[PDB]
Design an enzyme around this catalytic site. Sequence first.
Site, PDB file in Angstrom:
ATOM      1  N   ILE A  25       0.819  -1.208   0.000  1.00  0.00           N
ATOM      2  CA  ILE A  25       0.000   0.000   0.000  1.00  0.00           C
ATOM      3  C   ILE A  25       0.854   1.259   0.000  1.00  0.00           C
ATOM      4  O   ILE A  25       0.326   2.367  -0.048  1.00  0.00           O
ATOM      5  CB  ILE A  25      -0.970   0.033   1.192  1.00  0.00           C
ATOM      6  CG1 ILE A  25      -0.210  -0.085   2.520  1.00  0.00           C
ATOM      7  CG2 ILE A  25      -1.995  -1.097   1.055  1.00  0.00           C
ATOM      8  CD1 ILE A  25      -1.126  -0.107   3.748  1.00  0.00           C
ATOM      9  N   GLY A  26       2.173   1.082   0.055  1.00  0.00           N
ATOM     10  CA  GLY A  26       3.101   2.195  -0.056  1.00  0.00           C
ATOM     11  C   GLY A  26       4.419   1.952   0.655  1.00  0.00           C
ATOM     12  O   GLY A  26       4.656   0.876   1.200  1.00  0.00           O
ATOM     13  N   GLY A  28       7.917   4.202   2.820  1.00  0.00           N
ATOM     14  CA  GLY A  28       8.552   5.384   3.329  1.00  0.00           C
ATOM     15  C   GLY A  28      10.013   5.093   3.534  1.00  0.00           C
ATOM     16  O   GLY A  28      10.501   4.059   3.159  1.00  0.00           O
ATOM     17  N   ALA A  29      10.715   6.019   4.137  1.00  0.00           N
ATOM     18  CA  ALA A  29      12.091   5.780   4.479  1.00  0.00           C
ATOM     19  C   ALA A  29      12.079   4.865   5.683  1.00  0.00           C
ATOM     20  O   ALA A  29      12.956   4.059   5.849  1.00  0.00           O
ATOM     21  CB  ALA A  29      12.771   7.057   4.804  1.00  0.00           C
ATOM     22  N   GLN A  30      11.064   5.000   6.517  1.00  0.00           N
ATOM     23  CA  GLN A  30      10.979   4.221   7.728  1.00  0.00           C
ATOM     24  C   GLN A  30      10.730   2.748   7.438  1.00  0.00           C
ATOM     25  O   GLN A  30      11.086   1.916   8.222  1.00  0.00           O
ATOM     26  CB  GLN A  30       9.884   4.765   8.629  1.00  0.00           C
ATOM     27  N   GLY A  31      10.119   2.447   6.302  1.00  0.00           N
ATOM     28  CA  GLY A  31       9.820   1.075   5.923  1.00  0.00           C
ATOM     29  C   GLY A  31       8.763   0.875   4.845  1.00  0.00           C
ATOM     30  O   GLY A  31       8.179   1.809   4.348  1.00  0.00           O
ATOM     31  N   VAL A  33       5.231  -0.887   3.600  1.00  0.00           N
ATOM     32  CA  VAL A  33       4.002  -1.241   4.304  1.00  0.00           C
ATOM     33  C   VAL A  33       3.006  -2.033   3.441  1.00  0.00           C
ATOM     34  O   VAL A  33       2.771  -1.697   2.277  1.00  0.00           O
ATOM     35  CB  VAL A  33       3.286   0.029   4.831  1.00  0.00           C
ATOM     36  CG1 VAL A  33       2.156  -0.367   5.781  1.00  0.00           C
ATOM     37  CG2 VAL A  33       4.280   0.974   5.529  1.00  0.00           C
ATOM     38  N   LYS A  48       3.909  -3.076   8.798  1.00  0.00           N
ATOM     39  CA  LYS A  48       5.113  -2.345   8.453  1.00  0.00           C
ATOM     40  C   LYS A  48       6.366  -3.142   8.817  1.00  0.00           C
ATOM     41  O   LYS A  48       6.562  -3.532   9.973  1.00  0.00           O
ATOM     42  CB  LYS A  48       5.127  -0.988   9.172  1.00  0.00           C
ATOM     43  CG  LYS A  48       6.249  -0.042   8.783  1.00  0.00           C
ATOM     44  CD  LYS A  48       6.035   1.310   9.495  1.00  0.00           C
ATOM     45  CE  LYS A  48       7.107   2.324   9.190  1.00  0.00           C
ATOM     46  NZ  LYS A  48       6.981   3.453  10.159  1.00  0.00           N
ATOM     47  N   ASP A 144       7.560  17.660  12.522  1.00  0.00           N
ATOM     48  CA  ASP A 144       7.511  17.245  11.142  1.00  0.00           C
ATOM     49  C   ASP A 144       6.169  16.739  10.673  1.00  0.00           C
ATOM     50  O   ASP A 144       6.078  15.800   9.955  1.00  0.00           O
ATOM     51  CB  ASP A 144       8.575  16.210  10.878  1.00  0.00           C
ATOM     52  CG  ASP A 144       9.038  16.211   9.454  1.00  0.00           C
ATOM     53  OD1 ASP A 144       9.503  17.253   8.994  1.00  0.00           O
ATOM     54  OD2 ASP A 144       8.926  15.157   8.814  1.00  0.00           O
TER      55      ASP A 144
HETATM   56  C1  LIG Z   1      -2.170   9.334  -1.069  1.00  0.00           C
HETATM   57  C2  LIG Z   1      -3.276   8.321  -0.704  1.00  0.00           C
HETATM   58  N1  LIG Z   1      -2.866   7.249   0.189  1.00  0.00           N
HETATM   59  C3  LIG Z   1      -3.365   5.933   0.050  1.00  0.00           C
HETATM   60  O1  LIG Z   1      -4.161   5.659  -0.845  1.00  0.00           O
HETATM   61  N2  LIG Z   1      -2.930   5.018   0.950  1.00  0.00           N
HETATM   62  C4  LIG Z   1      -1.983   5.373   1.972  1.00  0.00           C
HETATM   63  C5  LIG Z   1      -2.334   4.929   3.360  1.00  0.00           C
HETATM   64  C6  LIG Z   1      -2.725   3.502   3.423  1.00  0.00           C
HETATM   65  N3  LIG Z   1      -3.058   3.066   4.765  1.00  0.00           N
HETATM   66  C7  LIG Z   1      -2.243   2.875   5.787  1.00  0.00           C
HETATM   67  N4  LIG Z   1      -2.815   2.283   6.832  1.00  0.00           N
HETATM   68  C8  LIG Z   1      -2.048   2.074   7.880  1.00  0.00           C
HETATM   69  C9  LIG Z   1      -0.707   2.470   7.880  1.00  0.00           C
HETATM   70  I1  LIG Z   1       0.421   2.063   9.588  1.00  0.00           I
HETATM   71  C10 LIG Z   1      -0.216   3.077   6.736  1.00  0.00           C
HETATM   72  C11 LIG Z   1       1.153   3.528   6.625  1.00  0.00           C
HETATM   73  C12 LIG Z   1       2.055   3.725   7.594  1.00  0.00           C
HETATM   74  N5  LIG Z   1       3.238   4.164   7.144  1.00  0.00           N
HETATM   75  C13 LIG Z   1       3.145   4.315   5.813  1.00  0.00           C
HETATM   76  C14 LIG Z   1       4.068   4.754   4.897  1.00  0.00           C
HETATM   77  C15 LIG Z   1       3.715   4.789   3.569  1.00  0.00           C
HETATM   78  C16 LIG Z   1       2.439   4.420   3.190  1.00  0.00           C
HETATM   79  C17 LIG Z   1       1.483   3.975   4.088  1.00  0.00           C
HETATM   80  C18 LIG Z   1       1.850   3.920   5.425  1.00  0.00           C
HETATM   81  N6  LIG Z   1      -0.993   3.274   5.683  1.00  0.00           N
HETATM   82  C19 LIG Z   1      -3.732   3.152   2.369  1.00  0.00           C
HETATM   83  C20 LIG Z   1      -3.308   3.608   1.004  1.00  0.00           C
END
Ligand SMILES: CCNC(=O)N1CCC(Nc2ncc(I)c(-c3c[nH]c4ccccc34)n2)CC1
Length: 336
Positions: A25-26, A28-31, A33, A48, A144
């Site tokens: 679902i995406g 980050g630098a942190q990890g 997910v 994550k 931040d």
């Molecule tokens: C720009 C629109 N974003 C989008 O469609 N999504 C992002 C969040 C995602 N949901 C989620 N639910 C729980 C967590 I914990 C995280 C999450 C944590 N750190 C992240 C870093 C990058 C992306 C997502 C996350 N993300 C669903 C998909």
Amino acid sequence: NQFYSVEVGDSTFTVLKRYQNLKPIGSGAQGIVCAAYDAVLDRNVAIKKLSRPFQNQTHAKRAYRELVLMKCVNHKNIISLLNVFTPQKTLEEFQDVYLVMELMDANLCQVIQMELDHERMSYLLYQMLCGIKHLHSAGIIHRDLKPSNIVVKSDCTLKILDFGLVTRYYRAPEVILGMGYKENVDIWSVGCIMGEMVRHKILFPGRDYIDQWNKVIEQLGTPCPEFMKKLQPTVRNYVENRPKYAGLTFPKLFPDSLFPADSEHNKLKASQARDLLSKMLVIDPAKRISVDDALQHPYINVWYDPAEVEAPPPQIDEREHTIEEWKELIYKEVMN
Ligand SMILES: CCNC(=O)N1CCC(Nc2ncc(I)c(-c3c[nH]c4ccccc34)n2)CC1
Ligand SMILES: [Cl-]
């Protein structure tokens, strides 16, 4: 075995068997997910995998801090930890950390793009303020906050993802200029997010802080002598040698053309929203509105519920360690 492995979003996830159908679902630098179905709980979760938590002391400290705080804090507008695990059996083999959290639907970067709705915007802002208030009461000053680390559900319920201390557009002047900060450093960031919900443009974009500062003074105006005198002499000199700008007034910055039009309610709300922006987007933090006062602002206060705002703070970050020490620290934290 109680784990299985799957490659997901170009990474290897080794997780408990309860977690099924992992989907990226995406990242980050942190990890990185994943979304997953938790067969034990009969619900979707987010998982994550911490990306290289031991690569250096910065990574390690962040991972430890995130783990401890996400455990300690229990507030509806801060992401909550459902489970934590490592697939490795010993400290010596210990490598990876998995965090399981509630699955949210989108981050604010998506919502921000939606057409402005006063009900939605005031509700999102209210919830952000509730979360920030709670963090601050615990001595946590984020510094931040940005759309990418704030998430929401289809129903507009909102949670902050992390605890702060790369996109720098949301950082306060006192941070950029190295003045030191107080709690309302986070209010500037809320103001930038709100301004972006209205304009659908980054308020203070910029390749670097020099560019960013120029956008700040061009739009808000050159700061006052009061503010200047609070700068280091050396910093002071750069800031004072910039061309002098009268600010754009907030009506020009956030004109009526950007707000829902042609009802009395809409006229009312546009002026209230602009008034709040005017109080948050204030360069001098001595003159910038507080969290508590923002929650009392008419644009926000319609949502106010004491049970959400006035929750008791948690009862728990300067010490340094070797990477080996942080590792054992993180491991024991993982093992509960
Ligand atoms: C720009 C629109 N974003 C989008 O469609 N999504 C992002 C969040 C995602 N949901 C989620 N639910 C729980 C967590 I914990 C995280 C999450 C944590 N750190 C992240 C870093 C990058 C992306 C997502 C996350 N993300 C669903 C998909
Ligand atoms: Cl820079």
